[PDB]
């Protein structure tokens, strides 16, 4: 978790509620804004918290020892590459093209 500290979108061990309010603060116009945080309920893991039409969603991220980022059926070399992928392709949800959501900006850590 210390190695992700260089990135301005990594918030570390902030709470789910704090993270949800950070990305919801600007409302539905902030659709796509995200941050990354450590998971507070499944310690060792990480979470991508993003804004989806004003609502906060939480996607789990698993990091290998080598830094690879696994997101369920998706694998990426890094969380950065995971982020860049979702900036270009919609997060795959059941509603498909009806709920197109790509990552836009990010909440800068309050440091």
């Amino acid at each position: 978790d210390h190695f992700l500290s260089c990135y301005p979108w990594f918030h570390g061990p902030i709470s789910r509620v704090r993270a949800a309010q950070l990305v919801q603060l600007q409302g539905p116009d902030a659709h796509g804004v995200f941050l990354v945080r450590q998971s507070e309920s499944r310690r060792g893991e990480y979470v991508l918290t993003f804004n989806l039409q004003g609502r906060a969603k939480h996607l789990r991220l698993v990091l290998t020892e080598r830094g690879q980022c696994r997101v369920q059926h998706l694998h990426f070399p890094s969380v950065v590459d995971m982020l860049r992928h979702f900036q270009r392709s919609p997060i795959p949800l059941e509603c498909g093209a009806a709920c197109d959501v790509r990552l836009s900006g990010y909440v800068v850590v309050l440091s």
Partner: peptide, 8 residues
């Protein structure tokens, strides 16, 4: 609580 991704 946590979001589930779906494959085609």
């Amino acid at each position: 609580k946590y979001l589930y991704l779906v494959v085609s």
